[PDB]
Amino acid sequence: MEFRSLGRSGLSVSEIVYGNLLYPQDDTPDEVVLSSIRAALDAGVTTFDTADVYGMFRSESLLGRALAGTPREELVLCTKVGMPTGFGPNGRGLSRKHVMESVDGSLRRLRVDHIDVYTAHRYDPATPLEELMWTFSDLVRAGKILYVGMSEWPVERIAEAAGIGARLGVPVICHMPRYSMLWRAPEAEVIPACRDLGIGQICYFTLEQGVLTGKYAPGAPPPAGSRATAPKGGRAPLMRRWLDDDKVLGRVERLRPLAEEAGLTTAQLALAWVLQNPGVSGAVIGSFNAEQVLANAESAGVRLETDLLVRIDEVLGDSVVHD
Amino acid sequence: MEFRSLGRSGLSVSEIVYGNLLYPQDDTPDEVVLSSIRAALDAGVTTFDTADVYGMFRSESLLGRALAGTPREELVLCTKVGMPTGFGPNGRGLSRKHVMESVDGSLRRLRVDHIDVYTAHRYDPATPLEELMWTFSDLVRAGKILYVGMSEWPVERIAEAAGIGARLGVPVICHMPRYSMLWRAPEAEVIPACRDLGIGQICYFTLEQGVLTGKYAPGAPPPAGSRATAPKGGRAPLMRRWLDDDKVLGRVERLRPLAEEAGLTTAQLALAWVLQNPGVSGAVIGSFNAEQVLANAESAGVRLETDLLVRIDEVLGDSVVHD
Amino acid sequence: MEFRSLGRSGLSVSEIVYGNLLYPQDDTPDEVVLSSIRAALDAGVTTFDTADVYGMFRSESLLGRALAGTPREELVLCTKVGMPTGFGPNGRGLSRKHVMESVDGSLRRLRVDHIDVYTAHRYDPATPLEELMWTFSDLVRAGKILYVGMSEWPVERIAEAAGIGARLGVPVICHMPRYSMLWRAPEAEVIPACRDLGIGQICYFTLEQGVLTGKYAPGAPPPAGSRATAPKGGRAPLMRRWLDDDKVLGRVERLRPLAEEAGLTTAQLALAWVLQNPGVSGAVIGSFNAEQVLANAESAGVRLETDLLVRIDEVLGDSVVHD
Amino acid sequence: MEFRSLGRSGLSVSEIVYGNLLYPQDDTPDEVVLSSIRAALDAGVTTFDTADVYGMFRSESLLGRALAGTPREELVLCTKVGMPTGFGPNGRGLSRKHVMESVDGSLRRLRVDHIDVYTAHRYDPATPLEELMWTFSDLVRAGKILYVGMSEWPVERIAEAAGIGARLGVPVICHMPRYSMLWRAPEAEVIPACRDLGIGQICYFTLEQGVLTGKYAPGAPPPAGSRATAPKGGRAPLMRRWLDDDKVLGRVERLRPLAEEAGLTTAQLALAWVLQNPGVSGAVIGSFNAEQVLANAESAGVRLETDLLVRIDEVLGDSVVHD
Numbered sequence A, B, C, D: 001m002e003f004r005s006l007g008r009s010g011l012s013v014s015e016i017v018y019g020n021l022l023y024p025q026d027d028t029p030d031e032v033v034l035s036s037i038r039a040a041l042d043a044g045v046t047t048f049d050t051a052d053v054y055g056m057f058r059s060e061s062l063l064g065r066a067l068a069g070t071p072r073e074e075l076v077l078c079t080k081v082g083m084p085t086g087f088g089p090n091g092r093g094l095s096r097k098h099v100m101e102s103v104d105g106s107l108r109r110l111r112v113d114h115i116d117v118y119t120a121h122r123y124d125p126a127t128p129l130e131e132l133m134w135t136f137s138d139l140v141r142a143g144k145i146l147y148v149g150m151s152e153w154p155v156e157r158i159a160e161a162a163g164i165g166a167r168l169g170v171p172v173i174c175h176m177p178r179y180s181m182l183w184r185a186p187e188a189e190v191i192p193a194c195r196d197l198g199i200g201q202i203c204y205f206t207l208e209q210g211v212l213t214g215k216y217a218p219g220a221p222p223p224a225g226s227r228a229t230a231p232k233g234g235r236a237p238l239m240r241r242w243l244d245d246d247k248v249l250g251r252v253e254r255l256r257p258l259a260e261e262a263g264l265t266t267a268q269l270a271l272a273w274v275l276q277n278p279g280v281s282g283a284v285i286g287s288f289n290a291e292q293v294l295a296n297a298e299s300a301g302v303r304l305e306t307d308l309l310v311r312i313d314e315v316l317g318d319s320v321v322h323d
């Protein structure tokens, strides 16, 4: 495994981060979840990404159990607060109340004294940033959290929060965008801004839910246990955008020669592609298959040639999404 | 139930707040107090107002017991410190000593780790605001209180305290005035000042102790179990001002047609009237009658027409108290 | 009992403070110490003055035991740190180390969660005031102490420490000088400076160890159990200054008519004299005799006429010590 | 024993500090380690120097056990954080994560609530000094550490950290350089800078691993149980520099007359030499021999004549290392 700095900080994360998102009513057995996390550790993954809301507390509980026994110095636990976990209007968002009432349950379920990275899930316009950042100061002073992150935040608001955190001794070191070969919205403004502010990216949908594994053929029936066949949760439509486009699916199939050139699967090429941006500390991978994790983990530290990066842009052409 | 922001904060309160004030020697059975709080929850009330001094600790103890089992994320607990609860000159006021010695008893009696809103009951000229605000900073850092409020405070002193709180990361978000159709002292200066400072009003005597239910006829014997018949405590004289005035009692009776126009009881009209001010986050209701609570709770989110607000002023005329 | 503000603070102290200083090898039985503290409470005394060093922890232990059961809101506990209580050079002074290692033993022996007033005993030139004041900030944040005081401090250094405390949210409200009818060193600079800085005086040797009770006749054998007969500790020489001067002893005897004029014992006149200075919050009294405490306690709130204050100066004349 | 101020602070250290460095696989029995620490206490040593990394936790555990029972006020415990103690890239360095995860193990092994001096072992360029100093602020606020130190740090970075510590109420009072008669690299810049910043030196290799005891003759077989015969760990090469130079070994032998002049062993002269610099608070001594400790301890407070300091420079000549 290769490691990077999360921003201007002393924290190193693995270049490959394991995420274990589950749906509130999910059919994936716990035994399959635990063996995937076990496969991530075997591949040298140190960094784990979860949320209170994932599985409605189940995702954090399973992770807590899988990692019990791993020495604490060897793990970076990233969790999130902001999505609804309680009934009523104080059971969500980034108020002092919701954050204070969230942290202790996250600690219990993960079986730890402190969370390495605590991420504000979504930006919440009701809470002033002075309220939020002082709430984070209190949790850092108490040693319940070490570092702060944000996911899906307007860039003006990232800068503001970084500013206040510098004043209050809150390390704001991490932003979580959607980033892949196909989705490059964050190249325009977010990564340039974040880099100046000492913030690194931990990136999600890096395989666009399997579309960048080359495993979906244009005009075909999708494979046996593929995500296309089992579309649980409101993320299935984000995938439908690409599966209902035989153009993209065919251009993704043409990357395979480029990958084999470099001695990679299409999956490893897509993961290595994200890792080529200096603004990126980590790529998150989803999988409940041990063999997929151990293989996806090997993208860590791979440099792609200037030549191969120019040919990738040519093949994908106008299917790429910018800003 | 409808919810509002308490000031410029992430905290939402219900538009209808339940208060459970008791007298130090009070004849109201506990079973009647517990069933009223139970009726408030059934009506969707999330926000509860009490004080150390109410019932001499009895009011907080009963509330603690009634709300045991309700998830913490679903409640906003507002309590007060400042009124005498101990013997001698340090057993009252807003000194570091009295506040530090008060908070832990409030937490025990309410059965909670933290109080949502901690209100300085009355302004106390002996304590410098620097002493008080640093005492509140220490309680916020420790996570024993989340937000700070004030009740019956000079407006210069609200501004001063808001200023220092912004500097020390103390959210000062709440002021508690007397406010009704008949008592509009806070329109003049308090609500305008508070609105600029990011402070919302949680309002009391919103029915002027039942006078704005239309239930008292000019020149009559007051009903069986009415507050006029059972005048316990030094709040009875504030009511006597209006009951010894057949003029007001007759003008209140003439609102009933205006209420029925809007499909409301006089009580619901009086409560909705307060809620029409943008500076108001919540109206407090007193009652030890389930049927009264469930009915008063339905004023939440009712808009009154411009027409009806002009006709209300005409009927009440010069009985209204301003500044 | 009458009460005063300790400085610009919300803390009230009794005008009569009980001190229980003992010598490291002292013959006074505990039963006599406990009954004196019991007599102080009966006289309405709320404020108690002690030190880690007094009796070598015995003075604090007895006070802790005597006051067990008294409600906490009704007491002001003043203790001191700075005098040697341990072996070696870190077993004394005002270093972070000595103060941090002192506070928990004081709390245990007094049987309390927090000390009302924590006094820096003597000024210590080795420790920078930034180190000391940050150590006091940490103890206030933790709620182990509420207010800070100083005893026998240069006035430049009182001002400096008051300045830093205002910056760090440390209430510096109390100075402890030697002050009596005969010893007026603090009138010159200390009380004027302290009054501008919001600091009140709690005063010691207010009877000059019994010399201002009129109980010592010039050219006589001192009474049976008098302090002159039992000169334990290095405070006996401070008394010898006045007992080896038949002039003063005779001028003190001539105050008795002035006292009887006002319906006071010479002791009550001497105590009331100190309390006439607006810069004074409290006079400390020593006694292990119940009848003396109950009588000395009655000086509280006595105003002396302008006439009587001019005649007192005439009688004592040039025996008075100024600066 | 003689004592000095550690910088501009209230902390006194003994002029002779005992260090107990061990190698991760070391043959020295625990019984020999415990009796050496016992000999240090008997010689009046109050100050003990160790590290998490020394013996891989064994050095701190033995020290913890040897000092159990010694009153806390009588000891200054100096430990270090920064060297690798865990697997992976967060198991080392000065990140919030590594420091937070280190302190509690150091406290447990030493059997104490707080560490007197916490030293950043090596400077770590990955961690910004704002992250580090706020991590130290949190540990001081919590009372887990009292004072902060640095070992082997660039001088620009000492100044920067001292600056931030003054702002955050972190006492930065201590630097640990290599310093002896033969190694004077720190005279050039480090001690002058440190003295202006209120930082004192606790010095190591003060005998250059026994070379300044005069016990190694040029062109000979080194004694029975001498360090030259048993070269464990990567510090043996630093010694080889001097043992492979018959010139130095012969010049060290010629100091013996100068030592006997002053009534000292060559060891006592070398230790007293370091202590002559006003910028030095303490000299660290290594030994697992009781008789060596009790003798080395007697250098404490010895003044050397101007005459003897000029003759020492003449004898050692160009073997001395400067900058």
Ligand SMILES: NC(=O)c1ccc[n+]([C@@H]2O[C@H](COP(=O)([O-])OP(=O)(O)OC[C@H]3O[C@@H](n4cnc5c(N)ncnc54)[C@H](OP(=O)(O)O)[C@@H]3O)[C@@H](O)[C@H]2O)c1
Binding pocket: A018, A019, A020, A021, A049, A050, A151, A152, A176, A203, A204, A205, A206, A207, A208, A209, A210, A211, A213, A215, A225, A226, A227, A228, A267, A284, A285, A286, A287, A288, A292, A295, A296
């Ligand atoms: N910060 C945020 O707001 C946010 C939002 C969403 C997600 N996330 C995080 O990011 C993660 C994203 O996971 P994701 O699964 O949604 O997106 P993804 O990582 O783009 O997709 C992973 C999926 O692609 C398929 N796949 C991966 N490698 C493969 C291989 N070598 N061969 C064949 N198929 C392969 C697998 O599904 P099948 O084999 O079943 O097709 C796998 O479950 C989540 O776990 C979560 O922790 C964060």
Ligand SMILES: NC(=O)c1ccc[n+]([C@@H]2O[C@H](COP(=O)([O-])OP(=O)(O)OC[C@H]3O[C@@H](n4cnc5c(N)ncnc54)[C@H](OP(=O)(O)O)[C@@H]3O)[C@@H](O)[C@H]2O)c1
Binding pocket: B018, B019, B020, B021, B049, B050, B151, B152, B176, B203, B204, B205, B206, B207, B208, B209, B210, B211, B213, B215, B225, B226, B227, B228, B267, B284, B285, B286, B287, B288, B292, B295, B296
């Ligand atoms: N911040 C402060 O300093 C402060 C000061 C005072 C009070 N408060 C708070 O505000 C609350 C005010 O309560 P309050 O009772 O004094 O004043 P209120 O809310 O104006 O009066 C409520 C009373 O009016 C009558 N009533 C209400 N709805 C009715 C209906 N639909 N039909 C018939 N009668 C009805 C009831 O008494 P009867 O039926 O018995 O006549 C009821 O107890 C207290 O509980 C307390 O929590 C705060």
Ligand SMILES: NC(=O)c1ccc[n+]([C@@H]2O[C@H](COP(=O)([O-])OP(=O)(O)OC[C@H]3O[C@@H](n4cnc5c(N)ncnc54)[C@H](OP(=O)(O)O)[C@@H]3O)[C@@H](O)[C@H]2O)c1
Binding pocket: C018, C019, C020, C021, C049, C050, C151, C152, C176, C203, C204, C205, C206, C207, C208, C209, C210, C211, C213, C215, C225, C226, C227, C228, C267, C284, C285, C286, C287, C288, C292, C295, C296
């Ligand atoms: N902050 C500081 O550095 C500091 C320093 C010293 C003391 N103090 C405090 O201040 C206190 C001073 O006590 P102190 O006793 O040294 O000085 P004091 O209060 O001037 O003297 C009290 C003594 O005078 C005699 N006395 C008092 N009232 C009397 C009466 N009505 N009739 C007859 N005799 C009477 C008693 O001794 P006999 O009857 O036995 O003659 C009594 O013990 C101490 O307890 C201590 O807490 C503080």
Ligand SMILES: NC(=O)c1ccc[n+]([C@@H]2O[C@H](COP(=O)([O-])OP(=O)(O)OC[C@H]3O[C@@H](n4cnc5c(N)ncnc54)[C@H](OP(=O)(O)O)[C@@H]3O)[C@@H](O)[C@H]2O)c1
Binding pocket: D018, D019, D020, D021, D049, D050, D151, D152, D176, D203, D204, D205, D206, D207, D208, D209, D210, D211, D213, D215, D225, D226, D227, D228, D267, D284, D285, D286, D287, D288, D292, D295, D296
């Ligand atoms: N801050 C840092 O980074 C750092 C780095 C290294 C060390 N240190 C500290 O500094 C200490 C340095 O210890 P050190 O032993 O490496 O260097 P040292 O103190 O220069 O050498 C001590 C050694 O010299 C010999 N010796 C001492 N006195 C003697 C006498 N009177 N007669 C004969 N031989 C004598 C002994 O070895 P033999 O008798 O076996 O020859 C003894 O073990 C360590 O314990 C550690 O705590 C700190």
